[PDB]
Amino acid sequence: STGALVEEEDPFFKVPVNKLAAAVSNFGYDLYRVRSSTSPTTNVLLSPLSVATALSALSLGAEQRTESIIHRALYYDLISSPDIHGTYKELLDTVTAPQKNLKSASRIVFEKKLRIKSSFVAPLEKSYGTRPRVLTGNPRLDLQEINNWVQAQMKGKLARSTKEIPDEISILLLGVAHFKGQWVTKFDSRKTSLEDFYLDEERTVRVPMMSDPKAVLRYGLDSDLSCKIAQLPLTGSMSIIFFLPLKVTQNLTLIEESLTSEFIHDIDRELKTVQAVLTVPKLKLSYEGEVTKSLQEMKLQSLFDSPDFSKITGKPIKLTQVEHRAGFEWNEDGAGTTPAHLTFPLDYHLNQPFIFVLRDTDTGALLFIGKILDPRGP
Ligand SMILES: [Zn+2]
């Protein structure tokens, strides 16, 4: 009984920037689901906000039908906003503020010699703080310039791309993000040690495992999903929510099917503070790849056929590539250290495949999502 335009009753989602954050985050969970389906045996690491942002910005140059196609994928058609792009600037300003430890940037890149209308550039730069790049047609220079842009946006925290530049670009969208933050409570690195990680029912590896035997966290068991949910706070009003299956498995699909902005808000409200025997693997992960094909499965295929971008230029152009680069890291770093007496202990050992969601507490925005089949790497 959903899909109708109704007034928002949930207080957290009445806030326009939170309503927008929930919309583009729901695009991000959609993209995550497609990628995870495509990658049943490899880690999935995504920061889809940078991709949603490139698409939202590009929709400024779309005529009405194409614009609506982009807006439907971003869930804008369920918002009743007079200023979607003004709200977006606020969203971006909030989640990339310095305390968030999150670098995120989106770029629109056009085929060589394209003449761009200043009536596109002006709202693009105002709301998204970005300017379109027109390629030169020299593959070496063009790849060097894009990597130099990623380097400056990410302050060198991502690896430069040794990937060849695509041969036939009309519109290329680039979404890049890096996150390395600090826990509210540091892990004692003296307690970090090599421990078993159950890749699956038959394969066990040894991985640097952080440990807090007396962790305070927020926790809840979701019986319907057979998974233990824990939330660990980060400095700068963010948290990581973990989804830990009860049985060793790489099949997280049932959990993945539930991931929406509204589900995650509900989970967050329902978690309760407990003490836990907590283990968390160290993570230093990176991803570089094209999400072109995944977006084509997300009702965006017509952007690649004959879309109408005549608000950008008179020359017929179309989406040809959407690139994502992401880097993500967590270690023991944190801001601080911490006749009967009864406790309620729980174990929370992330020593088997799990999903994590890095969420902004203020807006609820999805900042990063990982399916971690193997904490060592790809
Ligand atoms: Zn609520």
Numbering used by the authors: 35 to 372, 379 to 418
Task: Provide the authors' own sentences about this structure as they appear in the paper.
However, PEDF lacks a consensus sequence for the serpin reactive center region and exhibits no antiprotease activity, while being a major neurotrophic factor in the retina that promotes neurogenesis and enhances the viability of photoreceptors, amacrine cells, and other neurons. PEDF acts through the interaction with cell surface receptors, mainly PEDF-R, which contribute significantly to the survival of retinal cells. Biophysical and X-ray crystallographic studies show that PEDF coordinates zinc ions in five types of intermolecular high-affinity sites, leading to a decrease in negative surface charge and reversible oligomerization of the protein, thereby masking the target recognition sites responsible for its neurotrophic and antiangiogenic activities and collagen binding.
Crystals were obtained in two space groups, P21212 and P212121, with one and five protein molecules in the asymmetric unit. Importantly, all identified sites were located at the intermolecular interfaces and included coordinators from two or three protein molecules confirming the role of zinc as a promoter of PEDF oligomerization observed in DLS studies. According to our structural analysis, zinc binding to sites of types 1, 4 and 5 results in this fragment localizing at the intermolecular interface of the resulting dimer/trimer, impeding its access to the receptor. Zinc concentration corresponding to filling the high-affinity site in PEDF (4 μM) matches the level of elevated zinc in AH of some patients with POAG (2–7 μM), suggesting that this metal is unlikely to bind to PEDF under normal conditions (0.4–0.5 μM Zn2+) but may be captured under pathologic conditions.
